[PDB]
């Protein structure tokens, strides 16, 4: 029976499981323009809702979305804002200290998007660059820490979410955007002119996604992985994949065109939860 | 504007204010079997309700019961369970470091019910006899304490509300029932025969009573103290207390007949949130 102050004893006694969610994680967790919240994570957020209300025995649960932020995900988890999230965020052990983390959905390398044709092909060309970076990310540390260590001379210019990021540098108000490589593509999948950007750099950090729940719950925790064990084992994850990273996607109708990480194969066969 | 992970920001992005209450600590906040929750907390909660809506100009904000416990109730404020509670809750330094405490609502000390008509006049007259007390309390905290440095030998049996508590004493299986002198009036005034129970003994401790809200939270603690204040220092909080302190109350007609101690009309005079 879950104890109280637990994540299910929060949901049986509110008749309500609040999901966060992202409003421009794409593939992951974004608007479809369609009215409604998608994504490779999400699918999984779905899983997870309908085991919470076959654990509850409560099929008419209310569910609310809640969009939540890379800055303000942690607090707004830690007051109960929200119950668990599936998106883009980062397992780290930092992170660990604040919140948990599920079994991992996704595998990622931090790179940078910059216009076709101009000068930025690695790290090293943006010396003395305006560089935009989405505010609350890991990409936000490694940027500013390679700008002192390194002595780069960039101006960070800090946005709300990955869209805004991107719109700064569409704007020319940045030479490269750096992220998450599969966040990048995603936005450029939501770009007027999608041709014109590029992927470059080495990764400066190869991290894993996981779902976010409150740390200390470890019935919650263990729902959450074996609904995600569940979806990976059995195949299925791959095809959520296939479907948002190999096909068409809204809102524009544009592929991703990515493949299947050695990273997640191994896992969709021996899910586990650590940070790389 | 309320900051991410505060109060106010979680019920506007919820679209709800989530309110812990009692279910037996009368005449605070109780059920009144006419199917509200009542009291002269609850008057508070029902004001700072008000001033919430007010504030985030929702003058339809949806309002959500929640009962808890004093077991269980601190657990369920650190997961959002609940936003803010108005009951019977002391303020301590112990609790300080995983809440906060609006001003000061009361003032208690911590006695015995026993049979009138029987040999329980001071607390040592327990040695070696079973005791009851309401689990998660300070007086819980403090019967234990005694048991053990004083070596009474008392049977201590944990009841999980006061009216659960004084029902053990009722039905013989306990002498006494120790807990906050005025909860203990509360649950006399619903006996079958009220008249055989008396409050005995010196008071082991002098205790405030809050609202309780999640600590670091300031704008939350501010909204609900400047409403405290102004229904206290205008007079209301001397009416709410004539009101279910001075005249017949739910469920059974009875009166408490008590008297606003001086100390409770010099916080109402200068409020202020002090532990004792
Ligand atoms: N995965 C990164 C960046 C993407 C994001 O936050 O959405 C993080 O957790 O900081
Ligand atoms: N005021 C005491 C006892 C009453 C109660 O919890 O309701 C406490 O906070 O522990």
Redesign the interface.
Same mark, same amino acid.
């Given at each position: 029976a879950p /104890? /109280?102050?637990? @994540?299910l004893? +929060?949901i049986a +006694?509110?008749g309500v499981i609040?999901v966060g969610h992202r409003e421009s994680s794409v593939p992951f967790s974004y608007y479809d323009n369609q009215q409604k919240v998608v994504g490779y994570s999400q699918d999984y957020s779905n899983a997870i809702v309908e085991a919470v209300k076959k654990k509850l025995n409560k099929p008419d649960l209310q569910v +609310?979305l &809640?969009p939540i932020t890379s800055? !303000?995900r &942690?607090?707004?988890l830690? !007051?109960? @804002?929200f119950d668990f999230e599936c998106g883009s965020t980062t397992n780290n052990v930092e992170r660990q200290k604040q919140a948990a983390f599920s079994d991992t959905i996704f595998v990622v390398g931090t790179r940078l998007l910059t216009k076709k044709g101009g000068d930025i092909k690695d790290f090293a060309d943006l010396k003395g660059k305006a560089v935009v970076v989405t505010s609350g990310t890991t990409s936000e540390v490694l940027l500013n820490k390679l700008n002192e260590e390194q002595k780069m001379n960039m101006r960070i210019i800090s946005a709300k979410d990955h869209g805004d990021s991107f719109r700064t540098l569409e704007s020319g108000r940045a030479v490269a955007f750096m992220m998450d490589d599969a966040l990048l593509a995603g936005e450029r999948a939501k770009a007027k002119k999608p041709d014109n950007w590029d992927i470059v750099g080495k990764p400066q950090s190869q991290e894993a996604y996981g779902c976010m729940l409150?740390k200390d719950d470890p019935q919650f925790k263990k729902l959450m992985d074996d609904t995600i064990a569940q979806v990976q084992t059995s195949g299925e994850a791959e095809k959520w994949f296939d479907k948002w990273f190999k096909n068409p996607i809204p809102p524009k109708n544009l592929n991703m065109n990515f493949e299947l990480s050695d990273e997640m194969k191994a896992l969709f066969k021996e899910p586990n939860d650590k940070a790389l």
């Open positions: /104890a /109280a102050g637990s @994540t004893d +929060k +006694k509110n609040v +609310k &809640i800055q !303000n &942690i607090p707004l830690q !007051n109960g @804002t409150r």
